[PDB]
Structures are given as C-alpha cells and as structure tokens.
DNA sequence: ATATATATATATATATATATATATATATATATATATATATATATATATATATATATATATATATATATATATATATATATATATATATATATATATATATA
C-alpha cells in the first residue's frame, strides 16, 4: 500500500519536505543512524569487496590495452554494472541477456571499444560472452 | 621594713628600639656624573643563516573538509512508477466469536 494511489508534484514536495525536516531532528537522525550502524557496517562488508576486486583488475585489463584518463572510468563502470547483475540475479542465460543489452547500451551511447568490453567481460565474468 | 608592677626630683653608669650635630668606615635597597666590560627582556641600521606561526608569485605531488562536469558501483535518511508479500498504528464492506467502558 505504497504505490497505489497517483501522486503530483504537489504530494511528493509535501510528503518528502515534511520527511526530510523531520529527520533534521537531533533526537530523529541520531536515534535512526545510530540503530542502523551495525547493519548498514555488515552490508558493506559483505558487498564491497566484490566491487573493489572488479576495480583492481579491470584497472589491471586496461593497463595493457592502453585507456588513460576519463575514458578509464568508462570501462571502470561497464565492469561495475556487470558485476552488479553477477550479484543480483546469478549467473544463467539473464545474466547472458544482461551483459549482452549492457554491451548495447555501452557501445551505442558512450563510443566504448567492442575489444576493450569484450575483455572486461572476460576478466570478471571467465568469457567474452559471460556463459 | 621586705618582695613585685608603675609615675617622679636630681646627677651618673649598663643593655635595647629610634631621631640628631660632625667627619670617616663596613654590609644591604635605590637614583645620578663620566667611559668601559658581563648576564637578562625589548626596539633599531645593514647583509646573511637556523627553528616556529602566516600571506604571496609560478608549476607539480601528499593527507583532510566541501562545491562541480561526465557515466558507473557500495552503505545510509526520503519522495515516486508498477504489481506482489511481512511487521506495525488506523478507517471501512459483510457475518461471527473473545476481553474491556
């Protein structure tokens, strides 16, 4: 019972701006952060190191290919996003589907190297294709 | 008449705390007149070096607190578009049971 009923701009504006003056509170903000502290520490723990392993070696990949500055963050992100399906849904024919429309996406709108996705993928999934 | 605590009249001696008239000496706290030296706290005239707190002119690097231009990922507080489930505080459509005013 969340999403049920059309909100305008009007709602959202209200109903956020009241949120957002609320948890400006000492007493709100403190006492919510400090209940989830030891949750929010445990989520990162667990997720992050699957991401900076995807940054060390697709900095190592892209290295030997040649890519220096911004256009290293283009291909820093393919890998993310890649790794981030790899940690949503599993590995399977969607992850296929997925790496394949990313590929898509990528090359169509930011002019990234065909070569240099294939090789991403390869080092963080074990194959260019990602079966 | 004797012992004690005091004030006197008359000269003198001894010990102590002070003020003088006369010159001199010693130790101490100071202010001066005349040059010079030593240690200490400062202000200067002239160049230079060392350590420290800052502001600059010119490029570059490192750590920290923030604002950006460009796509992406992670944790957190929220508002949405679409259907679905769990927990919590409510109001209803329909009959029924239990506890309470």
């Known amino acids: 019972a ?3 009923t059309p909100r305008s701009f009007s709602q959202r504006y209200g109903k ?3 949120k957002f003056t609320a948890f400006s509170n000492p007493t709100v903000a403190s006492t919510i952060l400090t209940n989830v502290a030891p949750i929010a520490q445990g989520n990162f723990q667990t997720n992050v190191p699957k991401f900076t392993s995807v940054n060390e070696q697709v900095s190592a ?3 030997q290919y040649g890519v220096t500055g911004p256009s290293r963050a283009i291909y820093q992100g393919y890998g993310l996003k890649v790794a981030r ?3 949503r849904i599993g590995a399977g024919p969607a992850l296929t589907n997925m790496v394949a429309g990313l590929k898509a996406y990528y090359v169509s709108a930011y002019g990234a190297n065909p070569e ?3 090789a991403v993928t390869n080092i963080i999934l ?3 294709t990602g079966y």
Do not use: E, F, Y
């Open 85 to 87: 399906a790899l940690n």
């Open 16 to 18: 956020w701006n009241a």
């Open 126 to 128: 074990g194959s260019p």
């Open 2 to 4: 969340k999403g049920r």
């Open 61 to 63: 990949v892209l290295t």
């Open 116 to 118: 240099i996705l294939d």
